[PDB]
From Swiss-Prot, chain A:
ATP-dependent chaperone involved in the processing of proteins in the endoplasmic reticulum, regulating their transport. Together with MESD, acts as a modulator of the Wnt pathway by promoting the folding of LRP6, a coreceptor of the canonical Wnt pathway. When associated with CNPY3, required for proper folding of Toll-like receptors. Promotes folding and trafficking of TLR4 to the cell surface. GO terms for cellular component: endoplasmic reticulum; melanosome; perinuclear region of cytoplasm; sarcoplasmic reticulum lumen. Glycans are attached at residues 36, 127. This is Endoplasmin. The lineage of its organism: Eukaryota, Metazoa, Chordata, Craniata, Vertebrata. Detected in heart muscle (at protein level). Phosphorylated by CK2. It comes from Canis lupus familiaris.
From Swiss-Prot, chain B:
Detected in heart muscle (at protein level). It is found in: Endoplasmic reticulum lumen; Sarcoplasmic reticulum lumen; Melanosome. The SRT pseudosubstrate motif associates with STT3A during translation in normal conditions, preventing glycosylation of facultative sites until HSP90B1 folding is completed. It comes from Canis lupus familiaris (Dog). Glycans are attached at residues 35, 125. ATP-dependent chaperone involved in the processing of proteins in the endoplasmic reticulum, regulating their transport. Together with MESD, acts as a modulator of the Wnt pathway by promoting the folding of LRP6, a coreceptor of the canonical Wnt pathway. When associated with CNPY3, required for proper folding of Toll-like receptors. Promotes folding and trafficking of TLR4 to the cell surface. This is Endoplasmin.
């Protein structure tokens, strides 16, 4: 189980706070994830200033959100700097209204457990191979992605939604939320939506 | 090397117990008394083949102590006890009311009323040690007070505010009785009588 890890005590306590104090406005997890994605794009953009190889694995700088209503999943993918394996283990397993306090203290990512029974973070960084981080909140593991490098560069956050969080699978909801929290993000944010013959394509939200 | 993490299974188990028994929480005492009884049963067996078994403490009892000022509830038995290695493994790894005793996870029902649970235990083959937890981790350290128990274990609960009622004597006596009526070992509750004096009171 050299791939299995446990959470630092403080993180456990922190996840417990978010759940007990934000259960009346769970929709903020989308805000927090879109915000994280945006900070990630800012860093690769900052890296491309000095390193001229920074953007060779994925020239674009976007944020695409997809709804798999059949597998009960919600995907949020950015083409930011991404995270190395060691960063998945250290930065997600430890740390150094409360709606505003979370993003400021650096723990807004855990707001995802407000609507998910399981969170998965797939990531490719310019200096490592693609890896997968998974957790149901009672432990977590990190393994090399057997699919190889399918992201180029960036991160995908996958949420296996709670049955009560089923509404986050309907497009009308996500679009409303994506739009409401995409307002001040300096990057384009699309949503895989239907157009009704009935064809699917990326739809710009901001 | 004094702070450990709970195994994933235990984590899952604590939540289940807490999510499903929030309606009948008084169960926690039944579970502690029951465990106390098992412990006593085991030292008694050992005393059959081991003449030195009861060297550290000749009695086979279970004593319950309420401390309102400090907000603590103590459950002490004089059974076989637990060695440091056992506290670590047997506690960190593994109506449903009567379904938890079966699986052997009753202990955790203590978190239904306690923000923090402490386990002090002295086992014939080791020195006294202390296991503490708030459910988000746990730690095991050598008791700096020495071999104070002689032999056995003390379950100390730092009761939640909404658990203020288990601090009241008449309540514990009432509860300790309903569940001690089946244990073949004497259960006492440090009670009081009005001058006002304190002394053990037999419940079964
Ligand atoms: C200031 O940076 C932020 C930090 C500090 C730190 C961990 C940054 C990280 O160092 C490895 C990378 O530099 C950064 C580019 C990676 C992301 C933003 C990831 O998101 C995507 N899309 O990559 C996010 O994944 C869930 C990382 C964990 C987030 C946590 C625990 C959180 O709750 N809040 C945080 C939000 C932040 O903005 C946070 O702690
Ligand atoms: C069958 O034995 C029981 C086990 C198996 C096992 C761990 C037994 C233990 O092995 C080291 C000792 O042999 C035994 C004498 C010690 C006690 C009963 C302790 O209580 C006192 N007073 O000593 C209790 O402390 C909280 C131990 C943890 C209890 C757990 C996790 C539980 O939830 N249920 C259990 C109840 C049991 O009866 C249980 O798992």
């Amino acid at each position: 189980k050299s791939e299995k890890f446990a959470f630092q005590a403080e993180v456990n306590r922190m996840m417990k706070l978010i759940i007990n104090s934000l259960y009346k406005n769970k929709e903020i997890f989308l805000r927090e994830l879109i915000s994280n994605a945006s900070d990630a794009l800012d860093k690769i953009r900052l890296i491309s200033l000095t390193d001229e190889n920074a953007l060779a694995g994925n020239e674009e700088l976007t944020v695409k959100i997809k709804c798999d209503k059949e597998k009960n999943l919600l995907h949020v993918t950015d083409t930011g700097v991404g995270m190395t394996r060691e960063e998945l283990v250290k930065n997600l397993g430890t740390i150094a209204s409360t709606s505003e306090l979370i993003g400021q203290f650096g723990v807004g990512f855990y707001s995802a457990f407000l609507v998910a029974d399981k969170v998965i973070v797939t990531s490719k960084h310019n200096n490592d191979t693609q890896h997968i981080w998974e957790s149901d909140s009672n432990e977590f593991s990190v393994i090399a992605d057997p699919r190889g490098n399918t992201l180029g560069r960036g991160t995908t956050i996958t949420l296996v939604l709670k049955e009560e969080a089923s509404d986050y699978l309907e497009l009308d909801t996500i679009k409303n939320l994506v739009k409401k929290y995409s307002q001040f993000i300096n990057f384009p944010i699309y949503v895989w939506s239907s157009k009704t013959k009935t064809v699917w394509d990326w739809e710009l939200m901001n």
